[PDB]
Structures are given as C-alpha cells and as structure tokens.
Amino acid sequence: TLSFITRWRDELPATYTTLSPTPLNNARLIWHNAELANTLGIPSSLFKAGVWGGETLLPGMSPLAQVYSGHQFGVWAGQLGDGRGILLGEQRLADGTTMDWHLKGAGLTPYSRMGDGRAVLRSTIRESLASEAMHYLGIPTTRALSIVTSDSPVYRETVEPGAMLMRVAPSHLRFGHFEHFYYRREPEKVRQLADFAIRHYWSHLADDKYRLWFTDVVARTASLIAQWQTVGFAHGVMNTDNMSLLGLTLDYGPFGFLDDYEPGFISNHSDHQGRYSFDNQPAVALWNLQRLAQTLSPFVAVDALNEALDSYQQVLLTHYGQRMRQKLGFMTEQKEDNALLNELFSLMARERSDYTRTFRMLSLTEQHSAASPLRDEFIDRAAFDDWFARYRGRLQQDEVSDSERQQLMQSVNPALVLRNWLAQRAIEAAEKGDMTELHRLHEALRNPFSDRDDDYVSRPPDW
Numbered sequence: 001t002l003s004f005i006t007r008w009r010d011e012l013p014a015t016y017t018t019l020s021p022t023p024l025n026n027a028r029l030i031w032h033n034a035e036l037a038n039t040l041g042i043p044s045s046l047f048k049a050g051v052w053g054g055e056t057l058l059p060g061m062s063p064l065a066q067v068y069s070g071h072q073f074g075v076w077a078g079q080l081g082d083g084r085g086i087l088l089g090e091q092r093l094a095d096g097t098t099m100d101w102h103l104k105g106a107g108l109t110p111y112s113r114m115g116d117g118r119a120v121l122r123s124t125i126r127e128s129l130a131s132e133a134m135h136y137l138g139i140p141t142t143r144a145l146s147i148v149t150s151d152s153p154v155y156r157e158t159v160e161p162g163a164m165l166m167r168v169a170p171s172h173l174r175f176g177h178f179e180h181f182y183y184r185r186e187p188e189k190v191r192q193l194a195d196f197a198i199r200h201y202w203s204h205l206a207d208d209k210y211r212l213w214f215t216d217v218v219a220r221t222a223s224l225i226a227q228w229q230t231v232g233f234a235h236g237v238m239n240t241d242n243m244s245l246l247g248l249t250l251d252y253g254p255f256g257f258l259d260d261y262e263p264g265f266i267s268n269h270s271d272h273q274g275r276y277s278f279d280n281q282p283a284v285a286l287w288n289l290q291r292l293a294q295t296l297s298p299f300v301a302v303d304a305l306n307e308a309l310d311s312y313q314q315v316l317l318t319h320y321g322q323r324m325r326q327k328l329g330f331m332t333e334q335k336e337d338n339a340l341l342n343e344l345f346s347l348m349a350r351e352r353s354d355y356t357r358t359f360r361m362l363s364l365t366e367q368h369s370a371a372s373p374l375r376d377e378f379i380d381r382a383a384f385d386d387w388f389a390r391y392r393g394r395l396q397q398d399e400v401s402d403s404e405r406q407q408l409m410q411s412v413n414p415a416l417v418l419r420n421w422l423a424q425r426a427i428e429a430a431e432k433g434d435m436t437e438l439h440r441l442h443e444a445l446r447n448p449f450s451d452r453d454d455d456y457v458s459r460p461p462d463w
C-alpha cells in the first residue's frame with residue numbers, strides 16, 4: 001500500500017549505481033521504531049528480517065547506492081560514496097513530502113573502496129539511540145526505523161555480528177555530493193543537484209533563488225551546530241560528506257554526548273589533532289560551508305555566496321545565546337548574562353561537573369532560596385554558593401515566579417541524554433540476545449525532559 005517513487009533515480013541520472021542489498025546470514029529483526037512506523041503509515045504486519053534486512057523489496061522501491069566525495073580531516077579525499085548503504089527508495093507521504101529509506105550495512109557496492117560493505121551491531125545500536133535521542137531533544141537528525149542483527153562475522157578490532165539499520169530522512173544530500181561533481185568537472189551536475197534540492201525542499205522559492213537558498217543552507221547548519229553546543233553533543237567526524245545539506249545531524253559514529261563538562265572533548269579516538277573537538281564544531285562547520293560555497297560559484301554570484309557565509313556567525317550566536325538563556329531561566333535579556341554563564345562554565349569545567357545534571361538541577365532553583373541539590377555536587381562549595389547567590393539575585397530581575405521559570409527550564413534542560421555508558425549497557429545485553437535494555441532505553445529517550453527514578457539519569461561509573 002505504501003507509495004514509493006524513483007525521484008532520485010530518474011531526476012539525477014549518473015549519480016548512483018542501481019543494485020540490490022546482500023542479505024546477511026540468519027538475519028533477525030531485534031528492534032523497530034513503532035512510533036515512527038505509525039507516522040510513516042507502515043502496516044504493523046511488515047515487522048512480522050524482510051525489508052529491514054534487505055531481503056524483500058516493497059512496490060516501487062528501486063535500490064541504488066549514491067556517489068559522493070568529501071574533504072576528510074581538512075584534506076580532499078576524492079570519491080567516497082555509499083560504500084555500505086543503499087537508498088532502497090523514496091517514500092511519498094500523504095502530505096506530499098518524501099522520506100528516504102536508506103539501509104546502512106546493506107552490503108558491497110561500487111563505492112566500497114575495499115571495505116566489506118557491512119555495519120556492526122554495536123554501531124547500529126549506538127546510531128539508533130543517538131539519532132532518536134536527538135530527535136526528541138528537538139534537534140534535526142536522521143531517524144532510526146529498525147535494526148537487524150545476524151550470524152555473519154564482520155571483522156573490526158574484534159569480530160562483530162553484521163547488522164543493518166534502516167535510516168529514514170527527508171534527504172541524504174551531503175555537502176560532498178556537490179563537491180563530488182565540482183571536482184569531477186561536471187558543473188551542470190552540481191547545478192542539477194542544487195535545482196533538485198530547491199525543487200523538493202525549498203519549493204516555495206520562486207525562480208534570487210540561489211542567494212536565498214544558500215543563505216538558508218547556511219542558516220540551517222548554523223542552527224544545527226548551535227543546538228549541538230547547547231546539549232553537549234560532540235559529533236566527532238564533521239567531514240564534508242557527513243554534513244547534511246538540509247541541516248540534519250548525519251552519520252553517527254564516534255560521537256559522544258558530554259558526561260563531565262569538557263569544552264575540548266575529543267570524542268573520536270582517531271582525531272589525533274582534535275580537529276572535531278566539541279569546542280571546534282562551530283569553526284569547523286563554517287569551514288565546511290565555505291568548501292560547499294566554492295562548488296556553487298559557477299552559477300551563484302560570489303557576492304551572494306559571501307552574504308550567506310557572512311550570516312553564519314550571527315545566526316549561530318543568536319540561536320546559541322537564546323537557547324542558553326532558556327537553559328539558565330533568564331526570562332529577560334540582561335547585561336550580566338554572558339558573565340554569569342562564563343562563570344558557571346568555568347566552575348563546571350574546573351569541577352568536571354556533569355553537564356546534563358548541572359542544568360537539570362539548576363531547573364529546580366527557587367530564586368529566594370540558597371538551598372539546592374547543586375551545592376553538594378561541588379568540592380568548592382563556597383565558590384558555588386557565591387555564584388548561585390548572584391545568579392538568583394539576577395533571576396529576581398525577571399519578575400517571574402519560580403513556577404513559571406522551573407516550567408521553562410525543565411522544558412529545555414533534559415533530565416537524560418544518551419551517555420556512552422547507557423548505550424554500551426544496551427549493546428552488551430543485545431549481543432547476548434536480550435533486547436529489553438535496548439527497548440527500555442529507546443522508550444526513555446522519547447521523553448528527555450521528564451525526570452526519572454532509575455539510573456538513566458546517572459553519571460557513568462568513575463571506574
């Protein structure tokens with residue numbers, strides 16, 4: 001009954017290779033996203049490995065692997081592509097929008113570059129948990145519809161079970177798609193991609209279209225990174241092929257949500273220069289946008305490209321600043337705000353304070369009371385009490401009740417984030433065949449702004 005179309009295949013010829021997934025050995029479905037399946041209109045019967053393991057095609061699907069290129073760790077890498085993933089099809093929804101179904105781990109393709117074409121259970125689980133977590137934090141992201149595991153050995157640092165993730169997203173367009181055809185000296189294919197993107201995702205733009213479009217591409221990336229900074233998400237691999245044109249979080253690998261507040265956090269152990277450290281994300285995404293701008297210069301006026309690039313800073317800082325004010329419960333903008341936040345961040349960094357728990361406990365603040373669960377979390381309690389006294393004194397300038405402010409703060413400061421230790425515990429149980437933890441953790445991550453009475457709100461063990 002579902003409606004699939006071959007929009008990419010037919011409108012962007014010679015940008016992909018058509019092929020089928022390669023099923024794994026004894027593949028089994030271990031989790032699917034019931035809520036997302038409902039919003040997509042997927043009959044519950046389709047989950048009873050089937051399409052989720054690349055073993056069945058639905059009417060209208062026409063699987064293909066896309067080509068693209070990227071700058072990796074700041075240097076041009078040339079062609080990369082869908083080396084282990086396949087766009088099974090584009091699902092048309094009743095409101096006219098369209099959603100990609102991309103099977104990650106689907107098998108060898110022309111872009112596999114001597115790799116095995118496979119994904120592993122631990123990484124499919126992590127990507128499913130982080131992407132769904134990001135969605136319910138309200139941050140744009142690819143979504144996770146299903147995981148299958150299998151009996152197929154896949155060789156990494158150790159042998160792993162081969163697994164597939166069904167990833168859903170409005171598009172998998174990457175900055176690297178544009179770079180691919182620019183460096184392959186195919187400027188009309190770069191322009192075809194741009195016009196495809198505008199037709200399907202910026203359709204309201206009448207035919208100044210490129211200036212307005214690229215200004216909005218910049219805005220959406222600036223907004224994305226501002227959101228990552230506010231929640232403490234470190235991506236770890238901001239290569240240009242992992243930058244979504246639409247401003248979605250894309251390609252969860254060696255990511256991390258902060259536990260202790262560490263501005264220079266390096267989540268990716270292969271990032272030996274810290275290029276993708278947490279505090280570098282805003283500079284890196286501007287550099288990525290600058291590389292994307294270069295590809296558009298054959299048909300977008302340079303003044304327009306630079307007007308868009310110039311706006312990145314203010315879009316990012318306005319989003320970040322307004323969001324941090326919400327997190328602090330600053331219900332009017334005041335001059336001392338920036339200094340109070342710098343003081344708090346300095347306190348947290350020097351105390352190695354937990355990021356999420358600090359803001360969640362701060363949401364319990366009673367402006368006329370010096371008591372707080374935060375006091376016990378600081379070794380230097382006097383320094384904390386001093387900041388907290390000045391913070392509450394400033395809160396009083398808003399003239400807002402504790403009830404109203406706590407409601408706001410609890411609506412924007414999550415009680416829980418997808419910490420590495422939580423994902424790892426889910427992985428260990430799934431690997432032994434027990435999916436209860438994976439399901440329970442997914443359920444909790446759908447409700448990040450509610451308090452909990454279990455250990456999903458707990459810091460990782462010190463040892």
Ligand SMILES: Nc1ncnc2c1ncn2[C@@H]1O[C@H](COP(=O)(O)OP(=O)(O)NP(=O)(O)O)[C@@H](O)[C@H]1O
Pocket residue numbers: 080081082083084085104111112113114115116117118119237241242250251252253
């Ligand atoms: N095991 C693998 N076999 C084949 N190609 C791979 C494999 N792992 C990574 N690649 C390719 O190497 C390039 C860089 O990897 P990466 O940025 O980690 O993408 P990815 O996780 O495979 N997929 P995506 O989430 O779609 O970006 C991309 O072209 C990948 O498709």
Ligand SMILES: [Ca+2]
Pocket residue numbers: 260352
């Ligand atoms: Ca610590």
Ligand SMILES: [Mn+2]
Pocket residue numbers: 241242251
């Ligand atoms: Mn990638």
Ligand SMILES: [Mn+2]
Pocket residue numbers: 251252253
């Ligand atoms: Mn990856």
